[PDB]
């Protein structure tokens, strides 16, 4: 769509004044806005400290392990993660496109199939134990990426329990563990999310021919080239 | 004019000659007094934000006084200016007091002001007058007030109007008077334009639309009919959270009388610029009767007791057209990995077991006293048995007829299946009941900013909206 | 919930009690006008 | 004046309390004076990309071309630009000195041209 | 007990509500849990500009002079100072255990000397 701009107008209140839900709104979104351009325009984006993925297979603990460490996202939101493990699996798991989209893109759309990964067991959960063998397990993990996605989520509050007073909604965040396929043509893959993310204004002229991972990859595979 | 509404040209057409045959005979005119209004005018300030000159013109409503400024301060704007010191001087009166002090006035040629302070010499009240001619050209210095103030003054009016035989009102003069005076050579030459008949009789038309507020006994008696004219259904009902509240005071009755045989009364604000309803009775005893009557049922307290267990879906083939409701649970998809014995889980999907809801209404003048209504709520609960929990609201008038309604004939379809099995459609009474238990809310007051008429008190106020 | 007291036993809190000192007082209280007629001595009436 | 200082008060909300505008104000001039207070003294100030000026000069194209960026002021506003060209003027504005005084000044001043 | 967590929760007001103190507290709280933790989380901890200590004895003068300048304390406050010369004392104050403990620290601890 575009990039997030610096909000301008905030409301200011004066005496005997009746005040209306979006005159608070307006000042929330305000400052938090303000702080999260502090920090994603005056230090930067990404993974801050290791968050290096590991794989174990044993045979009395099955897992797949992620190092803690800190991360910024490219819309300022932390993200701090500390010794995951996870043990249990649920495929086809429908997840909404809009999940991936920008904030300010106000499109709906439809669900794509995913693999979910948890470190309890539950109802539809099969854990990682129950794998035939090892081999089994190495054709589950191949060609694969993590991605690790912070959900936002409108919850609206109980309106009777004791007394019946109007109530309104709360923002939740949650954390949830996908694991994509790298390259799948007509599926969601980690090069269509690369895609999107960084085809959206037109590079030059002389780099037009190359996908995202290639104009990346062609920038470290210089020097073993060309000299 | 007629004091009568018509569905058809013919009823109007009908009546022509009662109003005419009446109208000739000045031996059905009376004379009324209708006893208490209010003033309304301005105050003239100085730089020092203190008073020095007050208007004589008033009115007897607000609306009227808010209007006449444009072209006041137009006529005085023009026309008092361009003028030197030494005319302006001429404008202004000063005469001497009991205390040796001199108070000035001031008139122009008429617009006349009365002056506030008082001076120690003519001087001092010669400049206090080219001062306040120079000030009560600017908007800004201007002050709103009520006159006769610690209480506003009351006036009364005096007016005429036309009765058939035996007592009933067959018109009314629409302007007052402030004197007696006045009134008689109005109605002298009224009678004398009348008598000569140098007629003109014309039907007008009112709006398409119009609703009515209405107030019943508990016999279906009809009193307090309603004057004002409604554009649209939920108007009508916004407004009747403050006709019951307004109706609650003998303050707020205007008294309209007359030498023989005609009493009514007015039911207005509490600053009296609007009319809600007006009624005429032939006898003071019937007026004070039906004063006392209208006070009595706009307080009327109480409660009603709803058991949810009783509310349980029965049904056992919904094979058919329709079967039972249910109602709102409030669960998320996250309690799915969690017990159902939680005892937090438990309460939110299971709304009939030991629930009990109570609905009362909160326009009486005791149930509008928040530190009153906590009080009550609290001794309802110490009194109910150990193990049930209460639901607890105060409601409006729409929201409390809205329940009455589909409560009561759900209690009659009830009682019949049990009482020989002589019921019809009771599932669909009770299906017209279940929604409209989710839909009762609290009434608070509208929040207002505090600063140095009604301050916002925190959790106990309500938010407004953007337009 | 029931309402009991503090033990240096059961806890390590206690009830602090000290000695007022009469010559070392400060007083938090200040004047709503000043040197004005009706707030002040006629020892210190300036005639500004 | 003198340095922005650090905010010493901010209202607290307790039951059954009137509500003044002021606390609402004082809030929220709180939290904003703490945003601009991290951003002027633990990062830095002034411009931060190129904002470089070119004036160009064709016989059917007169314009004054500024190039994109961000920067910080010294009270922690931040202004960003994008390729701004500007082509028209107006002479003798007479704009006031006010604008250019430190947001804690309070007095009155005259303007320029 | 542990480290500062990072909110997931504020209040979202829709028309027709009755306010209450949890719904102002709860997002001021947030807002500044936002900022603190930007200071902390990314930036980091401890003295940034000197603050050097001197005791200087003179046969009129006895003081002790603290040096100006900036500091971040361990959960995002910022103290800064300038030039503060320290000339009485007070001996044998008792100061509340609470004063160096952490803001969720809930325990039982006797003032000190």
């Known amino acids: 769509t575009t990039t997030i701009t610096i909000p301008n107008s905030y409301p200011i209140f004066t005496p005997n004044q009746v005040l209306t839900n979006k005159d608070l709104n307006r000042v929330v979104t305000y400052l938090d806005e303000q702080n999260r351009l502090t920090r994603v325009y005056l230090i930067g984006m990404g993974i801050v400290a290791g968050m290096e993925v590991s794989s174990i297979y044993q045979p009395g603990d099955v897992n797949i392990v992620v190092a803690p460490g800190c991360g910024i996202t490219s819309e300022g939101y932390i993200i701090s993660l500390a010794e995951t493990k996870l043990t249990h699996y649920q495929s086809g798991v429908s997840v909404p496109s809009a999940l991936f989209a920008p904030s300010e893109e106000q499109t709906a759309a439809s669900t794509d199939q995913l693999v979910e990964l948890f470190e309890q067991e539950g109802n539809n959960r099969l854990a990682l134990k129950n794998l035939p063998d090892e081999n089994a397990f190495a054709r589950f993990l191949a060609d694969q990426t993590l991605v690790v996605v912070y959900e936002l989520q409108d919850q609206q509050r109980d309106s009777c329990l004791l007394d019946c007073d109007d109530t309104g909604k709360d923002r939740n965040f949650r954390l949830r563990y996908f694991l994509l396929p790298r390259s799948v043509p007509e599926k969601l893959s980690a090069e269509a999310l690369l895609q999107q993310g960084f085809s959206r204004e037109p590079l030059p002229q002389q780099w037009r021919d190359f996908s995202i991972n290639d104009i990346f990859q062609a920038q470290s595979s210089f020097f073993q080239n060309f000299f | 004019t007629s004091k009568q509404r018509y569905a058809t040209t013919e009823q109007a057409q009908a009546d022509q000659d009662k109003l005419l045959l009446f109208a000739l005979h000045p031996n059905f005119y009376k004379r009324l007094s209708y006893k208490y209004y209010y003033h309304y005018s301005w105050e003239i300030l100085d730089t020092q934000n203190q008073s020095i000159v007050r208007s004589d013109r008033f009115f007897p409503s607000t609306k009227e006084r808010a209007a006449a400024l444009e072209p006041l301060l137009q006529s005085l704007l023009t026309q008092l200016s361009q003028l030197d010191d030494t005319a302006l001087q001429n404008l202004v009166i000063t005469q001497p007091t009991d205390e040796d002090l001199y108070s000035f006035r001031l008139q122009i040629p008429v617009i006349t002001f009365t002056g506030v302070q008082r001076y120690f010499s003519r001087t001092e009240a010669v400049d206090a007058g080219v001062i306040s001619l120079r000030l009560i050209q600017d908007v800004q210095n201007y002050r709103n007030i009520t006159l006769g103030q610690t209480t506003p003054q009351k006036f009364t009016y005096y007016g005429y109007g036309l009765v058939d035989h035996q007592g009933s009102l067959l018109s009314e003069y629409t302007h007052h008077f402030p004197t007696e005076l006045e009134r008689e050579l109005s109605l002298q030459r009224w009678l004398t334009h009348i008598q000569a008949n140098q007629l003109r009789i014309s039907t007008n038309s009112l709006d398409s639309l119009a609703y009515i507020s209405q107030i019943y006994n508990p016999d279906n008696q009809l009193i307090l009919q309603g004057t004002q004219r409604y554009t649209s259904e939920d108007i009508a009902w916004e407004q009747g959270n403050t006709l019951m509240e307004l109706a609650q005071d003998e303050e707020n009755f205007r008294l309209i009388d007359s030498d023989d045989g005609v009493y009514g009364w007015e039911l207005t604000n509490e600053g009296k610029d609007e009319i809600f309803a007006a009624q005429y009775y032939n006898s003071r005893e019937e007026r004070t009767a039906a004063i006392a009557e209208i006070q009595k049922y706009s307080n009327d307290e109480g409660f009603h007791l709803l058991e949810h267990i009783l509310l349980r879906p029965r049904t056992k083939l919904p094979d058919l057209t329709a079967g039972d409701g249910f109602l709102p649970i409030l669960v998320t998809p996250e309690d799915v990995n969690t017990e159902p014995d939680d005892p937090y889980l438990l309460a939110r999907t299971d709304p009939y077991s030991f629930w009990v809801t109570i609905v009362l209404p909160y326009w009486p003048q005791r149930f509008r006293d928040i530190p009153f209504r906590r009080f009550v709520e609290r001794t309802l609960r110490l009194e109910a048995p150990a193990h049930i929990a209460l639901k607890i609201a105060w409601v409006n008038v729409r929201q409390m007829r809205d329940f009455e309604l589909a409560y009561r004939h759900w209690l009659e379809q009830l009682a019949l299946e049990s009482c020989e099995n002589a019921a019809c459609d009771l599932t669909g009474t009770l299906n017209r009941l279940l929604k409209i238990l989710p839909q009762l809310r609290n009434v608070y007051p509208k929040a207002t900013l505090h600063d140095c008429n009604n301050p916002a008190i925190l959790n106990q106020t309500a938010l407004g909206t953007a337009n | ?48």
Request: glycine share 6%; hydrophobic share 35%; no cysteine.
């Open chain 3, 1 to 48: 919930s029931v309402i009991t007291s503090v033990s240096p036993k059961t806890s390590n809190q206690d009830h602090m009690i000290e000695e007022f000192i009469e010559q070392a007082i400060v007083f938090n209280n200040q004047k709503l006008e000043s040197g004005v007629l009706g707030y002040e001595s006629l020892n210190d009436l300036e005639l500004g």
